Amino acid sequence: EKAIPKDQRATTPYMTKYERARILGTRALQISMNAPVFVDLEGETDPLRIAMKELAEKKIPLVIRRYLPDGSFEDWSVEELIVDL
Amino acid sequence: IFVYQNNITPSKLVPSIPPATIETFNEAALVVNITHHELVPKHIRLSSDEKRELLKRYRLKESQLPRIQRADPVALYLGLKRGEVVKIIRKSETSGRYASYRICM
Amino acid sequence: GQQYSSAPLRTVKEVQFGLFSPEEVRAISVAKIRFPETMDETQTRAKIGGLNDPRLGSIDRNLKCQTCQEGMNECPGHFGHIDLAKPVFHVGFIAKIKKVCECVCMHCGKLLLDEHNELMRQALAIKDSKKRFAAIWTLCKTKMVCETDVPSRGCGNTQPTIRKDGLKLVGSWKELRVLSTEEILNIFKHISVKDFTSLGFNEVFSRPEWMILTCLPVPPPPVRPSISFQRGEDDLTFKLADILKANISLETLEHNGAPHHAIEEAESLLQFHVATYMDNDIAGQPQALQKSPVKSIRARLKGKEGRRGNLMGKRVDFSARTVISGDPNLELDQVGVPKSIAKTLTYPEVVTPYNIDRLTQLVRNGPNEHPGAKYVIRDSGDRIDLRYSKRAGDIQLQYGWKVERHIMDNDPVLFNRQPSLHKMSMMAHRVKVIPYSTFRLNLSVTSPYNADFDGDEMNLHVPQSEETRAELSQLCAVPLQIVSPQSNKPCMGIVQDTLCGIRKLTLRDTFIELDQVLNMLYWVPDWDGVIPTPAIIKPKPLWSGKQILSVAIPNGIHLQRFDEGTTLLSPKDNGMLIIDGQIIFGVVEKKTVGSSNGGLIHVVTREKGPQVCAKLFGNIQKVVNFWLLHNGFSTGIGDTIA
Amino acid sequence: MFFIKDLSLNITLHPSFFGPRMKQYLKTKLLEEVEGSCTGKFGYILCVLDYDNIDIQRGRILPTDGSAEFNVKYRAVVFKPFKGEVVDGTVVSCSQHGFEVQVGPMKVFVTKHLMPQDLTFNAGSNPPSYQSSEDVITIKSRIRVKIEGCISQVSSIHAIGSIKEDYLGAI
Amino acid sequence: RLVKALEDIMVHYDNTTRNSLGNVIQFIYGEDGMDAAHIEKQSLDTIGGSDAAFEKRYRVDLLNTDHTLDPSLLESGSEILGDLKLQVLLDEEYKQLVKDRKFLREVFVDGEANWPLPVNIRRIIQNAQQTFHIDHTKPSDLTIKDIVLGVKDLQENLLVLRGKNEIIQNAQRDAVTLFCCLLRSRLATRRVLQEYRLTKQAFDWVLSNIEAQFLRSVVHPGEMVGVLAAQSIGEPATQMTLNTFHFAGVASKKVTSGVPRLKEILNVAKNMKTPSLTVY
Amino acid sequence: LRFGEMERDCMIAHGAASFLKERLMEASDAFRVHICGICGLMTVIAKLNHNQFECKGCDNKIDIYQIHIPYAAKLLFQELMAMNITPRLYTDRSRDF
Amino acid sequence: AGRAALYKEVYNVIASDGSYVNYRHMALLVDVMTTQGGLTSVTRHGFNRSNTGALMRCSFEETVEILFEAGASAELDDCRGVSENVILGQMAPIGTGAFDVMIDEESLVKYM
Amino acid sequence: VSTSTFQNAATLQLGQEFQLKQINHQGEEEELIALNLSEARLVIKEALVERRRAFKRSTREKELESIDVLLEQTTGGNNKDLKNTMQYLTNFSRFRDQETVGAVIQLLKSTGLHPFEVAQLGSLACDTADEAKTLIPSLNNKISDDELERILKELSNLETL
DNA sequence: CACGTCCCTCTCGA
RNA sequence: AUCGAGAGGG
Ligand SMILES: Nc1ncnc2c1ncn2[C@@H]1O[C@H](COP(=O)(O)OP(=O)(O)OP(=O)(O)O)[C@@H](O)[C@H]1O
Ligand SMILES: [Mg+2]
Ligand SMILES: [Mg+2]
Ligand SMILES: [Mg+2]
Ligand SMILES: [Zn+2]
Ligand SMILES: [Zn+2]
Ligand SMILES: [Zn+2]
């Protein structure tokens, strides 16, 4: 309904360790459910290491919808979020 | 404002003028200004255009703001009213200056 | 299991709290509770169409329920009811009933005060529901008369100073009147649609007239079960028959010859059962007992054990526990798990091209072989026990099946001492399956859990999905937690053996010869394989304690500490200075290598990384301990002698 | 009647379909379980209009289950019959107690007693018919009936019609 | 109780520390939006010490033959000697240093100069001297333009709350204010070239790493700071009164004013067991 | 083994949000109740292998939702109901901030 | 002014033995009681009386009593406190739950 | 999973799901959409054929085989309700070509009648104003009989062969 | 006048 | 088996 536009953002531009952790996890759970791998599986088996390689190449097709207390939010795409860690 | 020496008749008689805030303070607590004490920080009144600003800039609901008692020894000193906000500047050991805000419940 | 239901799946976002109406209880009730008989048509396993399964839940595992045909595991249960012959105060709303009767004209049904009073229009301004209803009752119990105007409004009956004897109310006039359940109910029902709403109530979800029970809801078996060994119902299934016994007395006692004294007794009796049934730890009262006390529904929920120990805390599958022993040849972020635990603890891996080749080998290894598996879960989902299934051999795995397989080397597990007073007291380690029945953890991770290896016991939890997995390894990993927010310092560090021998080692008198030096150098797995030019060469190639230690400290580290009188030409090997990961001077002690505010651990974890420092922990426990092995160290009564 | 309601459906997708041919399989699955459907609340869903413009938004990755969920806002042609609306329909079934009319995707039923008195049942006919003065409702004639009552049974809502009134009968 | 009154308390995406109602407990966790792990007890040399030594250690007088950066420490010490358009900034710099010194002495009335703050600067400069191998003899290839302006720009990029309107921006200045004091303290134009001997590369390296090591120290929106402070306060109390017999009869202030008073403090309670007025 | 109160607090500080749900659901009670879209209780007779859903008394057959909650919750709710307390579980919402 | 005294009286019993906990924690609790208007004690009446969700406050003392006056005042639980989700078996808006995760058809075909 | 939207005799007392004031899919507001047996066939045909156009990037009593093929190309087989509807619609559509149907809509929609009447008027072929108002009792007291009979006349005329 | 830390392991008696 | 009672361990 309401929502925020991507030119009025204000949240920390880096990836929250909880976001990184739930994205590496989320993709791992999805990758382990035989979901398409968008990265170049270079001799990989573990579905987490694939997701870590997917998050290292930022080829993860996920958007983090960061909910602010007022109810409204502002999505950030995994590929646009910096990954300082 | 009136300064009752030792007592005041409850002849209640105060809240009685619509376009007037009828304030009352005693001479005993006014002997030493409390706002001069080590632990009492700067309390600043907020204009109705400042409150309506801080509430939208922090995306707040009025209830969600930290509250300052109506009869707070400082809320009276500044003659606060219901709904007035007061930015509070305290010297913190992590940022040096930390802005807090309280609404007068 | 639980079959698939077309119904959409949602999460709960609002929980509406309110009160039943006697009419809504009659509505939902899948069966009227008519008999107090347990479940004895002929005491057969067939239950009685009166109590227990007149349509509610099922009593027998081999029996589908009479409402939702799913039977047992799936049947939520289905509430019944029993129409009360006489209204009854709710044990919990007892005081809240009085607080209202004090506020409203016990004859007029309108409020004792209204908006014409300065304090009532003030108290009424309070939209805080419960602070208003308190600010109303405060200034309402006093004015005890149905006024007629005083500038009209409204008949005038004086109001009684009400008090409670326990389960019944009385009010004085000037008259000792025991206020009736229906009479109060009749007053509450007549309360202005808007009057009770402004009194901290609600027009649809919490009408006052429902603090008085005209129709009781009967919970289904799953709430008050019954188990066999022959059978025996639940302490609340009993309490119900007790309530129904107390009701059927009133049902007939009042139908025919009305003796009023008896009527006014079996009613108070019934009020008792309905009261203790909900709360049996009442104020006055004897507190009932059946062949004893009895279990009040309120007692099921009382804090600590009872949905605070059923919902705030549960017992869980995929868990373990054993004695813990310390290992100096393990890595910091590891936990030596006994083989047996790794054969009982599983992980539902999903079949995929990435793992299918490993997975099928495990299956063939089975539940007895260490690197084996226990269950295989198909497309259809029914479980396939690899210990007893005939096809436990010629079984062909499909993509997308789940292979509940044994927990193997380097899975993430939640590890914890029990006084869980710490974010650190629950950490995630890599599994490392090992023999003997002890959990084994690296000696440096003792201080976080505050564990010693003296009959100490530690829990182990195991994730079940690849995301809770990553959640443990990306947040709760032991090396991720090396520096605590608690005191903004390292919460792990060198302790015991390693510490004692690391100042013994880092000395000038302490020299290491070649046959001993090459052993030390090898133990460092991340070793550059290059022999450090010996601090002393020619008389006899010797190495300094700190010098040899430095190959384990990672090049790129700079640390600086000055103790008492520590100079730039250290007098008593004072203080500490490490430059580019090699020791310059100074003895290594708790200050240097402990969990110090600016210790080596702290510096290495910040300017190098969490997992880098972790490997440091091991790289030192593997070397320092090795040196102490061949130097040795003891303690006797000689050391307590001056 | 025959309306166009702005509907929305919550479809859930397994992660294996989290590829490029996803929006396709979302629409494919949207119509799979909506196209030839019926409800009663909204009525006979008949055909989702405007295939091209069909929002899907961003799908929520379910908490402890990888699958994503989308609210597929769409628009479709529906059909909810109403008690009191006249509808012309083709006669299909024809019994001794009445005859069924095929109006749209549903079948309105007419009772012998809802037909005017003079319409007598004609068992003697390969296509059983209701002979009368002028009309002869055969197995496959066109009739204009007035819906009298509506019943919603699962994925189908039937009805009961009358032709006893005026301006009602054959075409 | 602690864990139960602080459950829902977690840093939120605007760096507010709120509960489950949205009620604001703090506007930046720890009044500086920082994470507790990236924080270290380093010293702000701008405060304690002699007014005389302060000049010695920070003041740079370009219009002077005695108090000017000797051309051996800068690249242009002799060509900047007397330069006055530049000494305006060495004043601006030295002026904000004293505005600093006199501010700290307002916050830390007792004159204690060692406090915890993110980014170990005492470390970073060292980890830069070893990195670029600093020549304690050869002069520095830095301009006064370089130092005082790099610092001024470094501060603008030390973000805590990211925002646009004055309300939030003015609480940016606040949140950082203290950290910047250590920054200006340790990046004094005299220090950089006299005792640090920074080259240009070494300097710019120190600036960029400071920027990140700070931007890392910002607490993460999600952190359950409340259920954490609760444990952080409750663990040592429950754990201190478990190691009381390691010394047998010692008592001390274990169960004397610790466990007791703390129970008072949490319950508040007017019937305090020792009401004392320490009147100065 | 009991994953008790204190252990919950620890994972909370960790922020292990979905590992905590895994702790208290997949590895414990966790039940599939059929709540009603208007009353908000288990009363939704679930004849799912015939696919009939009803909260008669609310006379509802479409507004049904299956929801994942601990059986301990399901009990706690029934128990509250047995004391004439309605804990109507709602999938939608009406506040905001 | 009191908030500072509260902290100072909290820190003064911490700095004795085990003489360090970081300001933030103490200040948060301290601020917790403070930011209400007066002292809000850490006790089953002090804080537990707030306008929090019903189930939340029932997870700490006065357990059945709280759920009573909740359904009697027709209370509503936000479902925003951790305890609520814990009781309900849902991922709590806590760190790894403070955000939601979505796939945009855009990205999925940007790497098709 | 089941369908939802935003928000009883046949005298305009429809459900709430078919109440005049109903919300859009953007969130605005727009009048109810009632189509006459004819306006419904085009709407379907158009939508069904414009689905085949995007499935390429991956007469009187003889048109009925032309629709069956479209239904056996785009829609899934099991969808049987759509087949009967198109059959039905194809026979009982008073108006065949878009041009005529528009005029019908142009005529009816400018009378103020609530869409159900707009719909029912274009689908039921009446002569008398007495017949029209007795089959669509939602009127009766609204449009005058003469004016209604005037409008009824333009209908029978526009009845495309 | 209601709380009274956390888990874990066994024994026995209606 | 469930309730109660008790003794230990960390
Ligand atoms: N009553 C208790 N409640 C909670 N935790 C306890 C309790 N008793 C012991 N513990 C926990 O178990 C450990 C108790 O110490 P332990 O019995 O192992 O003795 P110790 O310190 O090794 O004694 P010693 O001085 O003889 O070596 C601590 O980690 C403490 O947290
Ligand atoms: Mg021990
Ligand atoms: Mg010990
Ligand atoms: Mg002990
Ligand atoms: Zn059932
Ligand atoms: Zn009156
Ligand atoms: Zn219902």
Contacts for C277 with CB less than 8 Å, ≥ 6 apart: C236, C239, C240, C242, C243, C296, C297
The pair phi, psi for residue C87, each rounded to 5°, is -55, 155
- To which H or E segment does residue F22 belong? helix F17-24
Name which of E180, E175, E174, E172 is nearest E154 in CA terms.
E180
**Distances from the Cα of E71 to the Cαs of B92, E82, E87, E144, E148, in angstroms?**
41, 12, 15, 12, 18
Task: Find, among C95, C85, C102, C86, the residue nearest to C284 by Cα.
Answer: C95
What CA–CA distances, in Å, run from C63 to B23, C66, C67, C499?
77, 9, 12, 66
Instruction: List strand residue ranges (DSSP E) for D95-153, in order.
Output: 98-103, 106-111, 130-131, 136-137, 142-152
The partner residues of G103 in beta bridges, in order of sequence, read: A62, D59
Q: Return the residue matching tokens 């005695």.
A: E66
Closest nucleotide over all strands to G43 (CA to C1'):
I3
CA of C471 to C1' of J10 (A): 29
Q: Give me the amino acid identity at C594.
A: G
Q: For residue B77, what are the domain limits?
A: 33-105
The CA-to-CA distance between both ends of chain D, in Å, stands at: 20
Contacts 24+ apart (CB under 8 A), C367-372: C367/C343, C368/C343, C370/C339, C370/C342, C370/C343, C370/C406, C370/C433, C371/C406, C371/C408, C372/C343, C372/C405, C372/C406
Task: Show the domains of chain H with their CATH numbers.
Answer: 2-34 (no CATH), 35-161 (1.20.1250.40)
> Count of alpha carbons within 13 Å of C24, Cβ hemisphere only?
20
Determine the Cα angle at C22 with ends C18 and C26, to 5°: 115
- Relative to beta strand B98-104, strand B67-68 is parallel
Of the options 3.40.50.920, 3.30.1490.180, 3.40.50.300, 3.40.50.2300, the CATH number for the domain spanning C345-407:
3.30.1490.180
Q: Domain F1-85 belongs to what topology? A: DCoH-like (3.90.1800)
* Closest CB to G72 among C211, C298, C303: C211
CA distance C203 to chain G (A): 9
Q: Whole-angstrom distance between the N-terminal and C-terminal Cα of chain H?
A: 44
Q: Which chain E residues are closer than 8 Å to C487 by Cβ?
A: 232
| Residue ranges of E strands in C194-318 | 212-218, 314-315
Q: Which nucleotide is nearest to C315 (CA to C1')?
A: I7
> What is the extent of the structural domain holding E116?
33-220
Tokens, residue D38: 């019926």
Is the Cβ–Cβ distance between C158 and C228 less than 8 Å? no
Place of tokens 């003899």: E137
Domain range enclosing D32: 1-84
User: In whole angstroms, what is the distance from residue C626 CA to residue C629 CA?
Assistant: 5
Pocket test residue of C418, C450, C452 for ligand 1, highest count of atoms within 8 A of CB: C452
CA of C57 to the centre of ligand 5 (A): 5
Cβ neighbors of C614 (< 8 A, separation 6 or more) are C331, C332, C333, C478, C479, C482
Instruction: Decide if A35 contacts D59 (C-beta within 8 A).
Output: no
DSSP code at position A16: P
C277, C448, E248, E259 from E239: Cα distances, Å: 42, 12, 16, 11
Q: Is residue C420's beta carbon less than 7 angstroms from any atom in nucleic acid strand I? A: yes
DSSP state at residue C94: H
**Cα–Cα distance, F43 to F57 (Å, whole number):** 9
Token pair listed for E24: 């604001």
Please judge whether E224 and F12 are an interchain contact, meaning their C-beta atoms are less than 8 angstroms apart: yes
C162 by DSSP, 3-state: which?
Answer: strand
**How far apart, in whole angstroms, are the C-alpha atoms of residue H120 and residue H136?**
7
Take atom 28 of ligand 1 and give the residue whose Cα is closest.
C450
Alpha-carbon separation of residue C33 from C81, C219, C245, F45 (angstroms):
5, 11, 12, 19
CA distances to A64, D58, D59, H51 from G107, rounded to whole Å, are 13, 11, 12, 25
Residues whose CB falls within 8 Å of the CB of residue C305, separated by 6 or more in sequence, listed in order: none
Assess contact for C459 and C415: CB atoms under 8 A. yes
Euclidean distance between CA atoms C353 and A47, whole angstroms: 11
Taking the CA of residue C292 and the C1' sugar atom of nucleotide I12, their distance in angstroms comes to: 19
- The span from the CA of D99 to the CA of D93, in Å, is 5
Q: Where are the alpha helices (DSSP H) in chain B?
A: 48-57, 73-77
List CB contacts of C485: < 8 A, sequence separation 6 or more. C423, E35, E36, E37, E228, E232, G22, G24
Q: Please answer yes or no on whether A50 and C468 come within 8 Å at the CB atom.
A: no
Of D165, D160, D2, D161, nearest in space to D80 by CA: D2
* Residue ranges per structural domain of chain C: 4-87+237-278, 88-225, 318-344+408-481, 345-407, 482-634
Measured between alpha carbons, how far is C575 from C584 in angstroms, rounded to an integer? 11
- Which nucleotide comes closest to C450 if you measure CA to C1'? J10
List the one residue out of H44, C562, C532 whose CA is nearest residue D2.
H44
Tokens of H29: 């507001």
If DSSP codes are grouped into helix, strand and coil, which group holds residue D146?
Answer: strand
SS3 state at E80: helix
C399 contacts in A (CB within 8 Å)? 34
Q: Which stretches of G22-90 are DSSP H helices?
A: 23-34, 54-58, 63-72, 82-88
Q: How many CA atoms lie within 13 A of B61 on its CB side?
A: 12
Q: Please identify, by atom number, the ligand 1 atom nearest to the C-alpha of residue C418.
A: 5
Domain A1-85 architecture? Alpha-Beta Complex (3.90)
E17 burial (CB, 10 Å; 0-12 / 13-18 / 19+) is buried
- F45/C11 Cα distance (integer angstroms): 19
From residues 390-449 of C, list those within 7 angstroms of strand J by Cβ: 417-419
Residue C327 · residue F13 · CB < 8 Å: no
Spatial separation of the C-alpha atoms in residues C630 and C618, rounded to whole Å: 19
**Are A78 and A8 a contacting pair, CB within 8 Å?**
no
H or E element that contains E264: helix E259-267
The span from the CA of C127 to the CA of E220, in Å, is 37
| Alpha-carbon span D59 to A26, nearest angstrom | 13
- C560 vs C576: CA distance, rounded Å: 6
What does the block give as tokens for C614? 């972790």
Q: Is E176–B95 a contact, with Cβ atoms under 8 angstroms apart? A: yes
C-alpha C313 chain-centroid distance? 2
Minimal Cα distance from D39: which residue of F? Answer: F62
How far apart CA C83 and CA D147 sit, in angstroms, is: 43
* Optimal mutation site among B57, B59, B65, interface A, most CBs of chain A within 10 A: B59
The alpha carbon of H91 is separated from its chain's Cα centroid by a whole number of angstroms, namely 14
Q: Helices E84-107 and E144-156, interaxial angle, to 10°?
A: 40
Q: In the sheet that C9-10 helps form, which strands lie side by side, from edge to edge?
A: C9-10, F64-69, F31-36
Residue with tokens 């033959």: E65
Resolution, rounded to a tenth of an Å?
3.3
Contacts of E149 (CB under 8 A, 6+ apart): E89
Residue spans of alpha helices (H) in C141-190: 181-189
Give the residue from C427, C499, C482, C435 showing the smallest Cα distance to C459. C427
The widest CA-to-CA distance across chain D, in whole angstroms, is: 71
Name the nearest CA neighbour of B102 among B75, B65, B74, B48: B65
Chain interruptions in chain B, by residue before each (C–N > 2.5 Å): 11
Paired residues of D107 in beta bridges: D102
Question: Which residue is closest, via its CA, to the C1' of J4?
Answer: C292
Contact G49/B81 with Cβ under 8 angstroms? no
The alpha-carbon radius of gyration of chain F (Å, integer) is 16
- Closest-CA residue of E relative to C480 is E37
User: What CATH number was assigned to the domain covering residues C482-634?
Assistant: 1.10.274.100
C156-159, Cβ contacts within 8 angstroms, sequence gap of 24 or more:
C156/C108, C157/C105, C157/C106, C157/C107, C157/C108, C159/C102, C159/C105, C159/C106, C159/C112
Cα-Cα-Cα-Cα torsion C358, C363, C367, C373, nearest 10 degrees, comes to 50
Note whether E37 contacts G: Cβ–Cβ < 8 A: no
User: Where do the domains of chain A lie?
Assistant: 1-85
E runs forming strands in C48-102: 80-89
Task: Output b/e per residue, C372-396; b: 16+ Cβ within 10 A.
Answer: bbbbbbeeeeeebebeeeeebeeee
Instruction: Give the whole-angstrom CA distance, residue H80 versus residue H90.
Output: 16
Residue C275: name the closest of C524, C91, C519 by CA.
C91
Q: Which nucleotide is nearest to G62 (CA to C1')?
A: I2
Q: Does F18 touch chain A (CB under 8 A)?
A: yes
Give G-chain residues touching F70 at CB under 8 angstroms. Answer: 87-89
DSSP labels for chain H? --EE----BTTT---GGG-SSB--SSSS-B---B--TTHHHHHHHHHHHHHHHHTS---TTSSHHHHHHHHTTSS-TT--HHHHHHHHHHHH-S--SHHHHHHHHHHHHTT---HHHHHHHHHS---SHHHHHHHSTT-SSSS-HHHHHHHHHHHHHH---
Alpha carbon C52 to its chain's center: 32
Q: Cβ(C498)–Cβ(C328) under 8 Å?
A: yes
C-alpha span between C209 and C188 (Å, rounded): 5
Provide φ and ψ at C126, rounded to 5°: -55, 110
Structure tokens at H7: 């928000």
**Chain E residue closest to C475 (CA)?**
E223
Residues of G in contact with C200 (CB under 8 A): 73
Residue D43, CB half-sphere, CA atoms under 13 Å: how many?
A: 25
Give the C-alpha distances (Å, rounded to integers) separating G48 from D161, F39, F73.
Answer: 63, 29, 21
Reported as type and span, the H/E element at residue C163 is strand C161-164
Do chains B and G touch, with touching meaning 3 or more CB–CB pairs less than 8 Å apart?
A: yes
Q: How many residues does chain G have?
A: 112
User: Which residue's structure tokens are 């289905």?
Assistant: C78
**The CATH number fitting domain C318-344+408-481, selected from 1.10.3720.10, 2.120.10.30, 2.60.40.10, 2.40.40.20:** 2.40.40.20
* Dihedral, CA of residue C41, residue C44, residue C45 and residue C48, to nearest 10: 0
Query: Residue with structure tokens 């495309």?
Result: H160
**Backbone dihedral angles phi then psi of residue C34, each to the nearest 5 degrees:** -100, -45
Q: Backbone phi, then psi, for G37, in 5-degree steps?
A: 140, -45
* Contact by Cβ (8 Å): C490, C599: yes
Q: Which amino acid is at C199?
A: L
- Tokens coding E169: 């921006």
Per the listing, tokens 């097709």 go with A61
Indicate the length of chain C as a whole number.
642
Using the CB atoms, write b or e for G29-48: b if 16+ within 10 Å: bbbbbbbbbebbbbbbebbb
Beta partners for residue C233, in sequence order: C226
Residues of D in contact with F22 (CB under 8 A): 64
Report whether B100 contacts G70 (CB < 8 A).
no
Q: Give the count of domains, chain D.
A: 2
* Closest to E237 in 3D by CA, of C305, G25, C483, C453: G25
Nearest-angstrom CA–CA distance, C618 and C608: 16
Helix then strand count (H, E) for chain G reads 6, 2
Length C276 CA → I9 C1' (Å): 36
Structure tokens at B73: 């020894």
d(CA E32, CA E10): 14
Whether the Cβ atoms of residue C402 and residue C350 lie closer than 8 Å to each other = yes
Please answer whether residues C36 and C80 qualify as being in contact, where contact means their C-beta atoms are separated by less than 8 angstroms: no
> Which SS3 state, helix, strand or coil, does residue C452 take?
coil
Q: Tokens representing C94?
A: 């007892």
Experimental approach:
X-ray
Of chain E residues 84-113, which have a CB less than 8 A from chain A? none
Q: Please report where in the chains the tokens 């640390």 appear, as a residue.
A: C559
Q: What is the greatest pairwise CA distance in chain G?
A: 62
- Measured between CB atoms, which of B61, B66, B96 is closest to E22? B61
Where do we find the tokens 């040196």?
C627
The Cβ of residue F60 has, within 10 Å, a number of other Cβ atoms equal to: 17
SS3 assignment, position C477: strand
Q: Give yes or no for CB of G43 within 7 Å of strand I.
A: no
**Torsion over CA of C422, C426, C429 and C432, rounded to 10 degrees?**
130
Total count of residues recorded for chain A: 85
Q: Is the C-beta of residue C314 closer than 7 Å to nucleic acid chain I?
A: no
| Touching subunits for chain E (3+ Cβ pairs under 8 A) | A, B, C, F, G
What are the DSSP calls for B14-42, one per residue?
SS--TT----EEETTTTSS-GGGSTT--E
